[PDB]
């Protein structure tokens, strides 16, 4: 067959491998890392080499610590997957002892920074997206935001952040920790992707324009925007198309992680710092060393020091799993309007060529398939599927223009891009048969593909999918309502005609639906209706609804429950 | 630390182990066996060193052959699980060459016998249950049956069968191969469970009465019923409570399989024949040898020779799996009205005592938990659960009275019996925590327990369940409609108040639903509505819907798909 237990062995070990992200430096000279480890997402202190777990129960994230703070603020879903987060203070000297910050009622916590004195975060409720501050004086709403907004940085009383305030464009906003308020700075030529407040109290920001990315400095007093000149020209000669992150280190140096073609580079004051190939996260100064996270299509996220590339914290892949990843490459696929779609390809060592191939669209929109570890891809390659990961228009990493092409056109141009990648897989000799697997917006895309292009794929997996923009809209909080509005151009007609529930008649291929029951992003309710329509029309479908879980998986149990049936489904369709 | 891959390895091997049932003897000294082997239900010829697969694709069953016929009639679902069967002739000299008997439209085929000249079977369509004959003269409907009915035996032109024609009682019926018609013979004292036509053209039948079982002779000409006395008294001394099967061997000897307390014995002309402990199936004479099937709670069904107990065809369990079954016993649990519920207990070698215990109700009503192999039970024992298997009222094997107590009272006394067994598991020291898992009527029972006895189990798994008697009834064929009528006493009020869909508000425990999408016995559609109600009320639930599959699983793939989520769910609930 289908060797069920081998698939589970592989899949469970791919989930289990330790994955780390770098969050900052606390209690002077310890690293704060968030890790998938011991079967869950935990927060750890590292001093090189005890690793001390800070939380009891699994968490969802931590707020960004300012350097050397004596505490950590854990963000934990207290609603079984619906992402109503509560905040939990852990004093770094007493790990495992948590104190719920009761002043803040549960809400979808978006981002946040802890200064040591005050906790500043963005959060969404049913009625609003807001910027909040929690200090000794209690909880304050500093400003109501138009849409999704994220805190990037705080310096003194200045708060800087990124707002998604319209048309899919990203604005810079500032507020004040004392008085509050909101100053919004839009750019005419692109979107801001990252921000940090310089010692001079200006905001240095990554600006992503039509094709290129550059650094600018915004004076929040008068809104003047000037190009930031760096003492070294490595950065400008790199020609970056996206900025992952930037930050002023404690010693005043500007650290920038920028990318092109799905791989990043680290720059300090414009000077290129040697880094392992792949993608990098924030950069911290730690014991006079530059530390970052590093990942690639074959390297689970790990903490490395620069420029040596020396691992501080890494999970190692078993060798049999390493061998299953034959290799990766970037190809440029010609789409329907002559656009080239940057597609990452992961060749399985366990499949022939041509071989069964899954087009994997996970996450999105405004996500990117880069040279970064993907558990879905690895687990498909381990199961003997080649993987094609298309950066369809609406993806990030290739400029503002490519990313904005999706706005007002869900299940339009981007679906053509995904189809073009499928076609490329066959025509180039990669794929003997095509499947599509998607999660989130990708799950939405699976349903659009099967409804709009029947015959292209042999079978599809839709995880945590959008099936109806309209009912979803009705069920969404203020952040997601606004995001749907932006995505659809505020057009209720687009909401309707681009909803695959309205084109179920067209489905010819077998489909597996996987949905966490408490998903508050892509709710289950509409999915039940789709299943009724599939049943009434005699369609072949498989469905799996996962209990006490939502869009954000933070345990191995849930991860296995979401991922295993997807792989079993494909493995089984492969034998037919 | 739920070891997913370890459970998968055990469960896939437990499904994979070959399981055989004896069907008869063909072309003239070959055994006809139906086996789960090579991952599917197949028909084989066996001659004592070769096993020859007769079918191409997986089948559901074969019709009973008269000794030595040069063909086999396979019954295969041609509706992807909905159990609309076609019949397929295979000439035993040309295995793998099938010929669909196109004169017979697909229908739910219930039973059948092939004389070599004529194929006689019972079948249910939307509007009728009927006795049919297919000879060279085409298809003929011999008689319309009141409800479920099964052909038992044909001799010359006399057809004998068992009919469920009212009040849960089982009637003997006869018809004629030439003229057709229907003679029905009811007994006042009990139900007929088996029948065979003697050389003298009378019907020998197993009569199951209030407490004991006995053999009678029925003269179809005048309807006289007289006790059959046998030359040997071992059978009467045995005090059997049920008859499994009886048949006249080609030499005129009467073979009887009778059971008591979930274990059978074999008698030839009333004379006990040594047989391996457990349960036995039909008995054939093959090359001057008595051959039967044999199974026990630790022995997957196999073909053995009597009286030696010599295996002819058996799948061997791996050692590790054999040891996981610590032991079994029969206990008598006091129920709510003083009745003793005969419950089989399977102790797991991999659980402590007290230990996590699953009350397993699979199949039913009119089924029995006996000392017979159960893949669900073994696979729970292997995952570290003790298994408790109660013969609630409505079960067979303990007399007519116990079996008929369910009539008009679904989700009543029998649920009390199931709860009493759960209570006993805890009181006696076996169970540290209780779960309930059920399939088919057992699935119904899971839903009844969670709605009617919240807090009794920690969680439940309802597979292929009844959720609404009313909607199911609207979607049922003529056989199931009649059966629902019989079970509910034809009362629309019982249908309504005993449907767990009407009690969803009451569920406090996590619940996993498993359902094949084309189930035509317990349809999916009412399940979708249950899920909507569970969602709307904030209930924790897991659901798996299996594509292209129905109530009767005949492949490994489908079995894994139904069984794996059930075990994973319990194993995960166990860590709490």
Curated annotation (Swiss-Prot), chains A, B:
GO biological process terms held by the UniProt record: proteolysis
EC number: 3.4.19.1
UniProt subcellular location: Cytoplasm
Cellular component annotations (GO), alphabetically ordered: cytoplasm
Pfam families with a match to the protein in the record: APH-like_N (PF22173), Peptidase_S9 (PF00326)
GO MF: omega peptidase activity; serine-type endopeptidase activity
Highest taxon, organism lineage: Archaea
Keywords of the record: Cytoplasm, Hydrolase
SUPFAM superfamilies: alpha/beta-Hydrolases (SSF53474), Peptidase/esterase 'gauge' domain (SSF50993)
Reactions performed catalytically: Cleavage of an N-acetyl or N-formyl amino acid from the N-terminus of a polypeptide
Enzyme class, first EC level, given as a word: hydrolase
Enzyme active site: 440 (charge relay system), 519 (charge relay system), 551 (charge relay system)
Entry similarity comment: Belongs to the peptidase S9C family.
Functional note: This enzyme catalyzes the hydrolysis of the N-terminal peptide bond of an N-acetylated peptide to generate an N-acetylated amino acid and a peptide with a free N-terminus.
Protein name: Acylamino-acid-releasing enzyme
Organism: Aeropyrum pernix (strain ATCC 700893 / DSM 11879 / JCM 9820 / NBRC 100138 / K1)
Lineage of producing organism: Archaea, Thermoproteota, Thermoprotei, Desulfurococcales, Desulfurococcaceae
